[PDB]
Amino acid sequence: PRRPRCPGDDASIEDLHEYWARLWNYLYAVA
Amino acid sequence: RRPRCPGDDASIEDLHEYWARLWNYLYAVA
Amino acid sequence: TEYKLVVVGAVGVGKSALTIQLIQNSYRKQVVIDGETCLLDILDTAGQEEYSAMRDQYMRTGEGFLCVFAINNTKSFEDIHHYREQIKRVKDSEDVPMVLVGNKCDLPSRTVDTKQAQDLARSYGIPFIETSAKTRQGVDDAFYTLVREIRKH
Ligand SMILES: Nc1nc2c(ncn2[C@@H]2O[C@H](COP(=O)(O)OP(=O)(O)O)[C@@H](O)[C@H]2O)c(=O)[nH]1
Ligand SMILES: [Ca+2]
Ligand SMILES: [Ca+2]
Ligand SMILES: [Mg+2]
């Protein structure tokens, strides 16, 4: 269960979508 | 309009707050 | 216990207004429903509906849905069918935790009476609550009853 790293302001929409999916996956397992 | 990154030391609740923000943002800009 | 709630409906019915009144009276709020503490995440669907593979995933994350229409808008009440079909398409389920919401009940001018929306929700098998983001009436009831429906299923 690795905590995902938030991509910078240079990131695209897809990069945020990935981090959105990774954070959801992380916050789910960490519960 | 994009919510700024929570940081490296952001707690779980800080992540839950951010995730809800990014949830609405990613939908709106689709 | 975490709860992902999604608010859908026609543009201008007051989806954003209902979200603000819940949270700030942020899209997250900790409440207590039926003696059970809850963590509510709200998805306020912005803009107009379009084809999007990632928007579906955003809605697929939702565990409860609010079909919000305006009581002074006939079309917003007619589109309720359209939004429900979309939710069942994305969630891939006929029975999805859902609540029919008639917003702007504070307005004296009404084109959609309560009995019309009462029958529609009755045929769907879902609860129906009249709300008013202006007077904060029924706002909490709409979101909390949605959590009840999720607990039911
Ligand atoms: N009287 C009244 N007006 C409302 C209510 N909810 C929203 N409105 C009005 O509707 C306008 C747009 O609503 P909005 O939340 O942005 O629509 P939506 O986000 O597309 O669902 C706002 O300027 C509000 O003044 C309500 O419950 N009562
Ligand atoms: Ca678009
Ligand atoms: Ca598109
Ligand atoms: Mg809105």
- Token code pair at residue C69: 């229409």
Alpha-carbon span C111 to A25, nearest angstrom: 44
Strand, helix or coil for residue C116 = helix
Pairing of strands C2-9, C64-70: parallel
In the block, which residue shows the tokens 């945020």?
Answer: A16
Alpha-carbon span C149 to C97, nearest angstrom: 5
- Chains contacting B (3 or more CB pairs within 8 Å): A, C
Number of C-beta neighbours around residue C136 at 10 A: 14
Alpha-carbon span C99 to C144, nearest angstrom: 10
**For residue C2, what are the CA distances in angstroms to C14, C18, C38?**
25, 20, 6
Given a contact cutoff of 8 angstroms between Cβ atoms, the answer to whether C133 and C20 are in contact is yes
- The residue to mutate among C6, C132, C136, C137, having the most atoms of ligand 1 within 8 angstroms of its beta carbon, is C132
Instruction: Give the closest residue to B10 by CA, choosing from C132, C52, A6, C114.
Output: A6
The alpha carbon of B30 and the centre of ligand 4 are apart by a number of angstroms equal to 14
Alpha-carbon span C58 to C55, nearest angstrom: 5
The alpha carbon of C17 and the centre of ligand 1 are apart by a number of angstroms equal to 5
β-bridge mates for residue C4, sequence order: C41
Alpha-carbon span C44 to C86, nearest angstrom: 16
Alpha-carbon span C39 to C5, nearest angstrom: 10
Query: What is the separation of C-alpha C132 from the centre of its chain, rounded to a whole number of angstroms?
Result: 13
**Packing angle, helices C15-23 and C139-152, rounded to 10:** 90
Alpha-carbon span B19 to A4, nearest angstrom: 12
Alpha-carbon span C21 to C63, nearest angstrom: 21
Number of C-beta neighbours around residue A15 at 10 A: 13
Q: How many A×C Cβ pairs under 8 Å?
A: 4
Query: Which residue does chain C place closest to A18, by CA atoms?
Result: C54
Alpha-carbon span C91 to C61, nearest angstrom: 9
Residue C2 φ/ψ, nearest 5 degrees: -85, 145
Alpha-carbon span C58 to A20, nearest angstrom: 10
CA within 13 Å, CB half, C151: 13
Q: In C91-108, which positions are buried (b, 16+ CB within 10 angstroms) versus exposed (e)?
A: beeeebbbbbbbbbbeee
Strand, helix or coil for residue C69 = strand
Residue C129 φ/ψ, nearest 5 degrees: -135, 125
Q: Residue ranges of the domains in chain C?
A: 1-153
Given a contact cutoff of 8 angstroms between Cβ atoms, the answer to whether C83 and C66 are in contact is no
User: Residue C58: what residue type?
Assistant: Y
Residues lining ligand 1, Cβ inside 6 A: C 11-17, 103-104, 106-107, 132-134
Q: How many A×B Cβ pairs under 8 Å?
A: 32
β-bridge mates for residue C99, sequence order: C66
Q: Within chain C, where are the H helices?
A: 15-23, 53-60, 74-78, 80-90, 114-124, 139-152
- Chains contacting C (3 or more CB pairs within 8 Å): A, B
Span C1-153 CATH architecture:
3-Layer(aba) Sandwich (3.40)
> Exposure of A20 by Cβ count < 10 A (0-12 exposed, 13-18 middle, 19+ buried)?
buried
